[PDB]
Amino acid sequence: LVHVASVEKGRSYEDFQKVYNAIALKLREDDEYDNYIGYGPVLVRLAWHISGTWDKHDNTGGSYGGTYRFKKEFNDPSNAGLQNGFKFLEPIHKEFPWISSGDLFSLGGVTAVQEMQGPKIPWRCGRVDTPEDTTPDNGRLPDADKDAGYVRTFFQRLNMNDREVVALMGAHALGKTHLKNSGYEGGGANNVFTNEFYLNLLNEDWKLEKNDANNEQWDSKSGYMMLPTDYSLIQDPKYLSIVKEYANDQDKFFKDFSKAFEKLLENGITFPKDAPSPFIFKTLEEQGL
Numbered sequence: 001l002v003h004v005a006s007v008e009k010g011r012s013y014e015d016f017q018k019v020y021n022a023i024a025l026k027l028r029e030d031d032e033y034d035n036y037i038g039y040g041p042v043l044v045r046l047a048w049h050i051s052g053t054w055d056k057h058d059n060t061g062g063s064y065g066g067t068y069r070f071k072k073e074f075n076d077p078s079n080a081g082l083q084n085g086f087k088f089l090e091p092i093h094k095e096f097p098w099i100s101s102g103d104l105f106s107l108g109g110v111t112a113v114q115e116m117q118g119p120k121i122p123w124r125c126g127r128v129d130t131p132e133d134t135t136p137d138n139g140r141l142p143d144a145d146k147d148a149g150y151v152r153t154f155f156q157r158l159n160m161n162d163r164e165v166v167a168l169m170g171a172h173a174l175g176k177t178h179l180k181n182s183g184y185e186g187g188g189a190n191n192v193f194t195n196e197f198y199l200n201l202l203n204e205d206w207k208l209e210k211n212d213a214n215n216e217q218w219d220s221k222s223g224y225m226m227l228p229t230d231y232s233l234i235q236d237p238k239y240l241s242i243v244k245e246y247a248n249d250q251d252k253f254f255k256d257f258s259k260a261f262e263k264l265l266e267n268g269i270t271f272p273k274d275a276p277s278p279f280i281f282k283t284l285e286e287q288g289l
């Protein structure tokens with residue numbers, strides 16, 4: 001099963017920069033969302049969830065087909081809360097109706113990372129909407145209650161190694177958990193992309209507590225929170241070494257995150273040899289906008 005990237009007809013970098021800018025300007029405007037976190041974190045999560053259905057064994061799922069637009073996927077319990085991100089992107093899609101759904105959802109993630117002062121994430125266009133029957137069944141996204149071995153095995157299906165997994169999980173500095181979405185609560189209100197996930201894991205005093213949904217999570221008195229799967233990164237000796245590395249090297253974390261996140265967003269896609277090079281979008285700030 002082969003998904004060949006096909007550039008939206010006649011479109012070029014400048015077209016996609018316009019879409020980036022519209023997302024970025026709406027991120028700035030709609031600042032009240034989720035007690036003033038804004039939509040950055042939820043858009044990052046959306047990009048990851050639409051990508052994280054991929055299965056390397058058969059090339060099912062993945063970002064290419066834009067299948068999150070179909071009810072089976074939209075309604076996955078694992079996706080509860082992402083409807084907020086989809087509704088954010090609706091007016092962007094109306095303005096730019098030519099962009100494919102997978103391109104839009106993945107570009108939303110890139111835009112959010114960059115506008116939150118994260119690394120540049122190169123991004124390629126050409127995902128093509130596929131029909132409803134290509135939607136992957138629910139259950140491909142990861143559970144949060146499990147341990148390091150679960151996380152390691154889980155990510156092999158997405159062709160991610162230990163460094164890639166630990167880098168990707170640094171996104172858990174962003175936003176928060178919401179009890180009514182996932183059965184986990186808390187984390188604060190951060191909307192700046194930094195390496196603080198790693199620092200927090202290493203330097204906070206963590207307690208294993210039960211939340212109001214009767215699930216265990218790790219809490220600190222400063223207000224940070226780690227899921228069991230987050231905390232597993234300091235329980236496993238191989239993950240812990242990498243956590244330490246990123247805690248101690250912001251640039252290294254940014255570079256490794258960028259490469260893993262692009263990879264995630266591109267898994268499953270065949271780029272023809274004469275496809276455009278990846279685009280690196282300017283932030284609003286770099287444009288003086």
Ligand code: HEM
Pocket residue numbers: 041042044045048080081142143144145151168169171172174175176177178179181182183184227229261
């Ligand atoms: C073992 C892997 C992972 C597990 C089990 C997991 C689980 C979760 C859970 C349960 C939440 C809370 C959702 C809610 O209640 O609203 C969450 C939030 C989030 N996740 Fe993950 N996650 C994983 C990996 C990732 C990865 C790889 C990324 C992206 C690179 C990511 C990005 C985020 C973001 C940005 C949020 C905050 C959402 C918001 O503030 O609305 N997660 N995750």
Ligand SMILES: Nc1ccnc(N)n1
Pocket residue numbers: 171172173174175176177186187188225226227230
């Ligand atoms: N453990 C997590 C996951 C996502 N966001 C925050 N603030 N904490």
